[PDB]
Amino acid sequence: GLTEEQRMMIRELMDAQMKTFDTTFSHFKNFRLPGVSLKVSLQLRGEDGSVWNYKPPADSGGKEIFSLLPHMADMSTYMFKGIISFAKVISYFRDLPIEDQISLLKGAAFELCQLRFNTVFNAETGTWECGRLSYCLEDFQQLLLEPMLKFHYMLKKLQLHEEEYVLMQAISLFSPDRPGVLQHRVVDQLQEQFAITLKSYIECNRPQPAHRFLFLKIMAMLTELRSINAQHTQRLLRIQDIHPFATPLMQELFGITGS
Numbered sequence: 439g440l441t442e443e444q445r446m447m448i449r450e451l452m453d454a455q456m457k458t459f460d461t462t463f464s465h466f467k468n469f470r471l472p473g474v475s476l477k478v479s480l481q482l483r484g485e486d487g488s489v490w491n492y493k494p495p496a497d498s499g500g501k502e503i504f505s506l507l508p509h510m511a512d513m514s515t516y517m518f519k520g521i522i523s524f525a526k527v528i529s530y531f532r533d534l535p536i537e538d539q540i541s542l543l544k545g546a547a548f549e550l551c552q553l554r555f556n557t558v559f560n561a562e563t564g565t566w567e568c569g570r571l572s573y574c575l576e577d578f579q580q581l582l583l584e585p586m587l588k589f590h591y592m593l594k595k596l597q598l599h600e601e602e603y604v605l606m607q608a609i610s611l612f613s614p615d616r617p618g619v620l621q622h623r624v625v626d627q628l629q630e631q632f633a634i635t636l637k638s639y640i641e642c643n644r645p646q647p648a649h650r651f652l653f654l655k656i657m658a659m660l661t662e663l664r665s666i667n668a669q670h671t672q673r674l675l676r677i678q679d680i681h682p683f684a685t686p687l688m689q690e691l692f693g694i695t696g697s
């Protein structure tokens with residue numbers, strides 16, 4: 439019930455997503471593993487049927503608390519590469535000046551990573567199911583006090599379509615107010631078009647009373663996700679200051695100069 443401009447925009451996004459989101463994590467390899475606030479266990483299922491499980495340590499006032507950071511840095515880096523590839527496939531993004539492309543990716547990389555991670559989040563088991571890797575929240579309502587955690591549960595409950603997730607990714611990517619953006623007006627117009635497309639998609643394909651105000655719920659979540667991004671970017675920089683762990687790609691995305 440959309441225009442073709444809107445149908446072609448969704449098709450392009452869905453194409454970009456299909457080409458650049460390794461949903462089985464098959465090519466995530468050669469990552470570090472822990473030596474032999476909220477914590478996760480890590481499970482690795484081998485192609486032969488073997489399983490390794492890692493249960494994290496407790497806080498004893500020592501560096502043990504950072505044992506998973508190298509692994510997570512490798513996972514995040516793998517995800518960020520996918521997010522960068524996604525953006526670069528999209529015509530509207532490719533047409534932007536390269537400095538704005540970089541500014542938009544620096545601004546949105548965390549948000550797009552979290553949106554992709556929500557599609558592999560199992561809310562029944564509190565587990566991000568990443569192909570052969572599984573990350574399980576360690577033991578309740580104290581968990582939902584963490585804003586990013588409550589975000590994942592609340593977004594999962596909306597039961598969004600693939601198309602709605604990829605429009606969320608576009609709206610986040612084309613945010614006209616990230617630091618360093620110059621083509622503010624063009625980006626702002628592109629964002630509005632993606633939001634209108636999402637509003638119309640929901641109107642045409644979700645007539646049920648449960649999906650009343652769904653478009654507005656999604657937009658409020660995107661606003662909330664940007665606020666969480668700012669908080670978590672500061673958390674990353676504090677930990678990096680006392681315990682370096684960011685990969686080069688993470689340093690580039692989060693504004694660490696190397697000097």
Ligand SMILES: Cc1cc(C)c(S(=O)(=O)Nc2ccc3c(c2)nc(CCCCCCCNC(=O)COCCOCCNC(=O)C[C@]24C[C@H]5C[C@H](C[C@H](C5)C2)C4)n3Cc2ccccc2)c(C)c1
Nearest residue numbers: 475476477478506510511514548555566573586587670674
């Ligand atoms: C320090 C840090 C910060 C950022 C910003 C990143 S990032 O953006 O570049 N990648 C990333 C990847 C995935 C993220 C993820 C971030 N935020 C989530 C959402 C679920 C968790 C919400 C936050 C919980 C509160 N804690 C923190 O805010 C910082 O805790 C540092 C101290 O750690 C204590 C021991 N806990 C761990 O070792 C486990 C991890 C797991 C993950 C989040 C958090 C920091 C890292 C990465 C270690 C705690 N997910 C979803 C998801 C989680 C696990 C597996 C798969 C998906 C990085 C890399 C690092």
